[PDB]
Design a protein around this ligand. Structure first.
Ligand SMILES: Nc1ncnc2c1ncn2[C@H]1C[C@H](O)[C@@H](COP(=O)(O)OP(=O)(O)OP(=O)(O)O)O1
Ligand SMILES: Nc1ncnc2c1ncn2[C@H]1C[C@H](O)[C@@H](COP(=O)(O)OP(=O)(O)OP(=O)(O)O)O1
Ligand SMILES: [Mg+2]
Ligand SMILES: [Mg+2]
Ligand SMILES: [Mg+2]
Lengths: 496, 496, 100
DNA sequence: AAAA
DNA sequence: AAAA
DNA sequence: AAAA
RNA sequence: CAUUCUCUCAUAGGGAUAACGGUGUGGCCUUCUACCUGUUAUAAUGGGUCUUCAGUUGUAAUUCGUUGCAACUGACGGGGGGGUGGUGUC
RNA sequence: AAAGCCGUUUCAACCAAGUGGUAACUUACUACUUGGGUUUAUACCGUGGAAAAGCCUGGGCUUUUUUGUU
């Protein structure tokens, strides 16, 4: 049977992926436990393996049980689907933290139902993605957030004065009227077979309004819901870029942007998804840095981790704070935190100008930021000496950043924080009875940290060079010109 | 080296494809020669195998020679490309027939140069197709003509009065200014690497104005050239669908369509591609069948094999004439033409109510339109009894035809032409000394042809049923619902 | 061309031919502003545009920006006061307002 | 090339 | 899934 | 009547 | 309640099975890359150097878009608090 | 009174509901042939071979048949 084989394949692939993820999780937990014991000494806590809680809620949640008997599950699912009696089991809903907006309700469906939703979402997207607007960049295999950022950046750079309009829907997934959805199935030349229609209605049967949160089919439903809005905005002549609920509209005319506001309001009244007054900034005017403005003005706007201005694209300030938090915590964890314990038993005290903890911290920062690339490799790629370079670091999630000044400031911050953390480590070592101020990592001044660390060599490689954002940014630009956003962020798989 | 391996693979694949095509050609020529001898008897001409003429022009044109030493060719090509001295060899330009506009100049590049052009076109399209307008349906792996026809049909059906503007570019490929092209390389956020840019310039070096005809890189350059025009038309708020030069713009407002005319005029003045007043129909007004119009009015429009009206989509009249020509010629060739020869020696004269030539003609007709599908298979698919049905016929090139009346007229035409051809065959047999008017195929009246032919059975199958357009149209509609147009017309992503 | 040979950009300052060159340079801008329907009055670089419609004045801003990008003469944000709304002495205004 |  |  |  | 295999009344229930899946490090192959310097009969191994961008200069091609080469110039590691000096202004 | 509608009979290969005029054509003219792998017999392109023939030279060229092809 054609359907049953497809369901078998999808369920088996999903279960095997989850099993591989779990095995990677526990293997890396063991490895990190070994490293932690080598770091924290006798104060290191014991290895603690956690199986996800919902695996005990039902056996079908467990990837191992599903992989045990997946043929039977697929057979029963196909039999129920072809009898028009199939109904997905109740998901496990948890209170995912959303302190920005209070709380958010996410749902983890059972493995068979999640697999069925993924399969039918793939089918529906495949046979209908040609009807989706090219400016909808959410939940697609042909559209990315980076395409949206590139489009916005290019269009903003073309002109000097642009009228913006930012709108976030209050509860986009949880307030779609089912009458509207059932009416949308026969519009825009959408090709939805009766089987897919029945499956969609099956996933909406438990609730009376809104679509489930955490299933693949809900992504296609969300994309399909905002088709009339996309068509209306396109026919108004405005440029927009919708990513799930986050909508940005920009045009060179005030009348067009007012009509866009009216169109979004009408669409919200038609679908019942009221806009969020707090998140939606309203209508603004994006000018240059010092151009006078007659209405509410802003010099830059934020869109999915990017702070876009007229001249350049830069990392969002909150994302910059996240990067700073991660790097600073790496330094604190590998340099300071072990020395704040009650006892230093089992810890290696730096001596003979060999601080392995500093080396570990620098290597982990490079792994976080570059991804493990030495400066030699990046320079070789830039010179054209080499043709292969892999981009998987924090920068691979912002390939389109062309703000060199922000990266310069970030590099200066990294160097300064490294110097200050080393000073605190030296102070703590002195307080613990070890004078090391004259040794290698601590005797360095802030100005000479990079210069001397570049020369330092271990095992025929320069593992001590302080990584820099500007170099990897140059590599990102060359990669983009040769590979293109897709391949560049292909490993990155931004997703989120 | 990465580049040389890629060139090797591309050249080998292209040469193997050409070799397979040639082997299929000569095998089917031999088979058709056997059938012809079984048809014309002693008057059948001898088998004549044609090798393409340009294979003798140069060895690199020959697929067999290229497959003989493709490693050396790829090595030399890579070496020349890295030295920035590579230059494609002169193509073989012939006079492809364009009686509608005189003649058309097409160029068949050598296999290595064609392979290089295909490879770099694939790369450029892959890393830049996200920048192409979603309404450019030519020379893409994500768009086809059927998506354009679906879009136009849906939008026309939405309203009742639409302002059209149909334009064609005169010698669009051969009049693009190279200055414009070289200026376009740094716009719209296009990602073209120096190697790709050098290759593009290499393919334009022989001429001074216009892009070559018959290479994939030409297709990419054509798509890239009309990006500013696409952006301007989108920002005007008009709906358009451009396929190569063919551009259909339709809007609900006269002012928007006049501005679209001005935009196309400005783009032509910028790129030097003038519009031929002959093929360009100007600005019209698409209304319903009997709605009064205040300006030049038309009830239907033609767009690439489809005659689109407000209410329904139908086959273009010229394409209908092509279908009629093919079917009528099949009947004439298998029924009448053998009997018009000087002698009937070696021919099987129908007897005992068994006209094999009629059976052969009916089977070939069914192969032409159905593709070999019996009515039982199509009815089984329609009922849902079966889930597999393949669409490879004349109607697989028009999956979006929803004009049932036109197909009804075509079916009536098929039945009537079959009856008249059978009458002429009976007359010729009588003139040749054989009375067969009382036998099976000839004694049938026009009304009873379909019924008795359906009742007729040979070898446990109904090979005599007269094929019908309506049945395959129902199958096509169900196939569109259960699978996106893409797959149904997938093997038919070519042209004319 | 002789009077422009010494330099590679811009026209010489303080000679008569530069006056005609400056007048000729801003001809496409003048035509565009006229065909927008806005009223304006240019005196060398100093330009004032006034219309009764906000859309026309926004289009005039865009036209001047396009002309500057075409000719390479950027506008200084300091001396350029931007778009305002000239009302009477005590008429309420919805956007940035000036009385003279 | 979506799960949460 | 692009030419000849 | 038109600038240094 | 093997996460292995198998059976079926098949999103559930039986059977026997001790392996099933996965991680870091290393070797082999395959990519893979500029220069300089250590050791051996010329190749491994060891230690170093540089790579980017912009402008100008001159040069060679260019199908006039541009490209190559050579030399110079410039850019190429944040901010905040306190003290202090010079410069700056009445 | 018509138009119209409903029959019934007859001519035609199609274009042709047409043309000044009416036939031809599919390796043509100007986009496709059976659900996917797995091997008995049939058989193809080109190249080998073995036979014959017909030319040049005194071995070479050309054409047919056979074989591997398969
Ligand atoms: N990382 C993620 N994992 C799972 N689902 C996600 C993730 N990010 C977003 N989503 C889903 C659930 C979110 O509700 C939806 C996007 O909506 P969101 O931007 O949160 O606004 P909202 O309209 O739901 O507002 P609110 O969160 O205040 O209710 O996409
Ligand atoms: N087989 C083809 N498929 C697609 N595009 C083609 C093909 N051959 C040529 N082209 C491109 C380049 C040509 O300019 C054009 C062919 O369309 P055509 O109707 O011949 O008009 P044209 O552009 O040649 O104008 P004109 O005949 O007035 O000079 O499209
Ligand atoms: Mg929202
Ligand atoms: Mg054309
Ligand atoms: Mg006739």
């Amino acid at each position: 049977m054609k359907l049953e084989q497809q369901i078998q394949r999808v369920i088996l692939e999903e279960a095997k992926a989850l099993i591989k993820d779990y095995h990677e999780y526990h293997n890396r937990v063991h490895l990190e436990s070994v490293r932690n014991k080598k770091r924290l000494g006798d104060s290191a806590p014991d290895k603690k393996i956690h199986r996800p809680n919902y695996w005990s809620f039902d056996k079908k949640f467990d990837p191992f049980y599903v992989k045990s008997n997946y043929k039977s599950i697929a057979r029963s699912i196909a039999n129920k689907i072809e009898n028009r009696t199939y109904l997905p089991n109740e998901p496990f809903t948890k209170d995912v933290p959303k302190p920005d907006g209070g709380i958010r309700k996410v749902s983890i469906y059972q493995i068979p139902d999640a697999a069925i939703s993924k399969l039918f979402f793939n089918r529906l997207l495949a046979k209908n993605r040609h009807r989706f607007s090219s400016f909808s960049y959410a939940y697609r295999n042909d559209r990315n957030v980076h395409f949206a950022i590139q489009d916005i950046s290019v269009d903003l750079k073309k002109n000097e004065r642009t009228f913006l309009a930012e709108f976030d829907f209050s509860d986009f997934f949880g307030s779609i009227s089912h009458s509207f959805l059932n009416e949308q199935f026969n519009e825009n030349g959408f090709y939805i077979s009766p089987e897919e229609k029945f499956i969609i209605r099956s996933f909406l049967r438990e609730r009376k309004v809104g679509i489930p949160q955490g299933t693949s089919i809900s992504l296609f439903l969300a994309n399909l819901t905002c088709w009339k809005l996309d068509q209306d905005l396109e026919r108004e002549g405005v440029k927009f870029s919708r990513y799930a609920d986050d909508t940005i509209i920009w045009s060179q005319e005030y009348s067009k942007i007012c009509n866009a506001f009216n169109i979004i309001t009408n669409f919200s009244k038609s679908a019942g998804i009221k806009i969020n007054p707090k998140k939606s900034e309203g209508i603004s005017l994006l000018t240059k840095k010092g151009l006078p403005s007659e209405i509410t003005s802003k010099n830059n706007l934020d869109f999915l981790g990017y702070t876009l201005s007229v001249e350049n694209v830069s990392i969002k300030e909150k994302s910059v704070k996240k990067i700073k938090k991660q790097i600073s915590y790496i330094l604190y964890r590998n340099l300071i935190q072990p020395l704040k314990k009650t006892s230093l038993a089992g810890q290696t005290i730096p001596a003979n100008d060999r601080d392995k903890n500093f080396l570990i911290a620098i290597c982990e920062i490079r792994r976080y930021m570059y991804g493990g690339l030495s400066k030699s490799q990046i320079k070789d790629y830039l010179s054209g000496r080499s043709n292969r370079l892999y981009f998987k670091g924090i920068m691979s999630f912002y390939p389109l950043v062309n703000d060199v000044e922000q990266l310069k400031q970030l590099d200066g911050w990294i160097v300064s924080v490294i110097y200050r953390a080393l000073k605190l480590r030296c102070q703590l070592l002195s307080k613990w009875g070890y004078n090391r101020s004259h040794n290698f990592p601590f005797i360095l001044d802030r100005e000479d940290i990079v210069d001397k660390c570049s020369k330092k060599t271990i095992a025929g490689r320069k593992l001590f060079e302080i990584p820099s954002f500007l170099l990897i940014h140059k590599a990102l630009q060359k990669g983009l010109q040769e590979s293109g956003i897709e391949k560049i962020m292909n490993p990155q798989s931004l997703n989120y």
